[PDB]
Amino acid sequence: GETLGEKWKARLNQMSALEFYSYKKSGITEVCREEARRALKDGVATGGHAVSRGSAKLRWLEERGYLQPYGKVVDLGCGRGGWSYYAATIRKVQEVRGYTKGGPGHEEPMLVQSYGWNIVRLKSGVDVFHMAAEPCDTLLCDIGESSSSPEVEETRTLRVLSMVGDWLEKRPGAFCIKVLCPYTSTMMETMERLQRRHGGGLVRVPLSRNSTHEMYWVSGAKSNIIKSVSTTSQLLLGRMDGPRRPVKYEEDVNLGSGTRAVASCAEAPNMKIIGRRIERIRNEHAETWFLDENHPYRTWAYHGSYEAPTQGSASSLVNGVVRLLSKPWDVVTGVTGIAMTDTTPYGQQRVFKEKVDTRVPDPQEGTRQVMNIVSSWLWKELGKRKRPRVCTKEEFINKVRSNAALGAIFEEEKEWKTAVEAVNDPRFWALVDREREHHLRGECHSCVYNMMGKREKKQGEFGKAKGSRAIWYMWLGARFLEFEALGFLNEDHWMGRENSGGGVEGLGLQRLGYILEEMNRAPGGKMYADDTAGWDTRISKFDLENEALITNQMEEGHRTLALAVIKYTYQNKVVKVLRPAEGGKTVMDIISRQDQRGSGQVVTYALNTFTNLVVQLIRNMEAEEVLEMQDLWLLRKPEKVTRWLQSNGWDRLKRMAVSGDDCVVKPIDDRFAHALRFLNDMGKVRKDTQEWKPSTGWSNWEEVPFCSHHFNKLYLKDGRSIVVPCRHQDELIGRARVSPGAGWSIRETACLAKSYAQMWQLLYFHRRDLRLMANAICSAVPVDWVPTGRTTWSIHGKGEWMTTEDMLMVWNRVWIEENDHMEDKTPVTKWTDIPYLGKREDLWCGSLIGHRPRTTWAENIKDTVNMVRRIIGDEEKYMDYLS
Ligand SMILES: Nc1ncnc2c1ncn2[C@@H]1O[C@H](CSCC[C@H](N)C(=O)O)[C@@H](O)[C@H]1O
Ligand SMILES: [Zn+2]
Ligand SMILES: [Zn+2]
């Protein structure tokens, strides 16, 4: 016997177009989305508006008592986030995690600053069917797709309930999952079993058009299932006759704005150390100083806030001359997605809360000892044929570029427009001389960190630009005290390969491949290139204690200055950063922390290299059965560690290649793939993998990623061989066609395009698309125009391409004449003699040789280039690099 709902769907389909239109809204309740859609069309994220209707559905279920949200809220099919953003406003809710399918056709999560947005984490591109269930407190799901055939809605609704059946197996205290088709005979005793097993009932939310029978399976309900589904069918059937009734209008929920207070687990401040700097900042902005009860800092100590103007932008321009010369890539999402990052207060605080506001537990006691042994042995190793020294002011002057950040904080430090101007003002060196005096008296007065978002070219997130990574540096006078105490590590090349065996400091991309090729000649197992997830946030206070052991090899007075710069600046940090507030105003927060590593410290690269070496040196020990599982707690016989280093330490170092946090290790066997107890206990958890799954290695060294590239071995036409770097072509092109500028002129972007083109000729000459596209750009840009900009942030991209000199002449200097891996120094005089990658690897790394749209782009490039010359201006002087 067909159910009442099946007779409702029978009539619903038999209606005509006009019958349907009169019935869809007849007598339903509806929220007022007018004054919300406009603010959302303008970009007003501080308006307290809800991102969709579904937010008002959730409130109705809450007021009635059907839903009691709390704890970790998981929101399957969160859409724009209507359910997630409302959940983050409830008193008992403390974490919101929503997932949705993105891409074309589907809604992507919105970015709004409603109340509690800091506890929200939305992720797109997720298909919840292929997503394993995790424990949670509140489970939300709003995933159906209406159709017209009840056999499809039943099939789709059954498929949904087989997916949420795994999540409910984890016993969530509250849930609200959407049943799209509850009215069929099969769907009724599918729900009858699920109600016996998990409880709750079916509720019909009046904020729903009469054209769907959808009901929500909520936890605070207990109405009988057939009675629930059928009573709704009688309402929907009854509305099909006769008169059309008015729609009742409610007022939309207003979620508010700001952040919400959070449980604090931050370490106890050392107000004897950082107290003077906090007082100095508070007194400077004393007129607007206050304490915000709603600050979002879990693992940083909070000291106060004051009103401040906003900084940064979320805008990203396009390079017109690269975009025209790279037409066939306008349909590749691999390049069209690359756009600048978002450095506004919201843009960085959004990434800060998830990535930098963390707290890794202290390593165990045996671990902490092994670290101390290996680190003290590594400093003694590095400092054998090399001694620490104090660097001078005369050195620091000749090392500040034009774009060295001043970075003042206190009013006395705000007297100069540029850094090179300040370093010539004797008042500047008076502030330094005055600060070092405080250091020698055990105090610190000026050394405070500036934090902000780094401006990069990365793949977008949702529809918009991705949030920004944090960079932090101190004011110029404090950065000099840093330099004269620890700068010897950089200026004396402690981390170079000659001194450390495993370092690579100072080298460029044009030489790293020869190190991996040499590393493959020694015997052993596969190569391993695991990466720590967010390295600068795992540098514990014990990692910092071990780095401070360099001060043992110092003259006593030099040890004093370094310890003042370490005890007051590295082991205690006073950070200044912006945050959005309630109402659109932006505010400055003063926070403090006692672990992690600042990105802009003078010795960041050197110390990250040191600690990463110590990490891989220990992981070799666990893999060779020197350290056991009892050793993590209490170090058994410590003499067994000192002997493994004295016998094999220098050889394992020769088997590595470490640049900062990036590393590649060639162990002696594949036990290194599953030596993880010390790796995890030190906080150095690996990236994009499960915390205990053994790692994967490469049998082929021409595939190992290192410093964002891999390296292939090529052979010049007749004879010699070079080892070149290579990466996926889509991000090389994609970065080149995004211009960082804020309204640049045509001449100025055409210069930025000559930089990406000439860099390609130097490092990626072996990519058929880039070799052609670089000649096309260099033919469309005037010859005498000098390249501007920055085509890479890599410390290994040295920049031999930022020149007007002939590119073939700077090519020979880099790859032949000044390449020590080149016995024969015969010059190369024609580009046609410089080879390509194999047609297989080109395609594998993003090339489009065989595709029709690229074959046409090639044979039209001369006409394409002549069209670009009129756009730069055909009265300029051009050369024909295309032949
Ligand atoms: N298999 C799947 N995996 C993840 N998301 C899916 C999915 N199938 C559909 N979706 C998404 O789930 C969303 C449900 S709409 C619900 C959104 C939310 N209630 C709000 O108030 O905004 C749709 O946007 C759809 O794109
Ligand atoms: Zn100081
Ligand atoms: Zn490649």
Residue numbers in the entry: 5 to 887
Quote what the paper states about this structure.
Nonstructural protein 5 (NS5) is essential for the replication of the flaviviral RNA genome. The MT adds the 5′ RNA cap structure to facilitate translation of the polyprotein and to decrease elicitation of the host innate immune response.
We expressed the full-length NS5 from ZIKV strain MR766 that was originally isolated from Uganda Africa and determined its crystal structure at 3.0 Å resolution. The MT is complexed with S-adenosyl-L-homocysteine (SAH), and the RdRp adopts a classic ‘right-hand' structure consisting of three subdomains: fingers, palm and thumb. Two zinc ions are found in the fingers subdomain and at the junction of the palm and thumb subdomains of the RdRp. The overall structure of the ZIKV NS5 has striking similarities to that of the JEV NS5, with the RMS deviation of 0.55 Å for 751 Cα atoms. The MT of the ZIKV NS5 connects to the fingers subdomain of the RdRp and overhangs the NTP channel of the RdRp. The MT interacts with the fingers subdomain of the RdRp primarily through a hydrophobic network that involves residues Pro113, Leu115 and Trp121 from the MT and Tyr350, Phe466 and Pro584 from the RdRp. The total buried surface area between the MT and the RdRp is ∼1,600 Å2. Notably, motif F in NS5 binds with the MT and has a different conformation relative to that in Δ264. The net effect of the presence of the MT is that the RdRp has a reconfigured template channel and possesses a more open NTP channel.
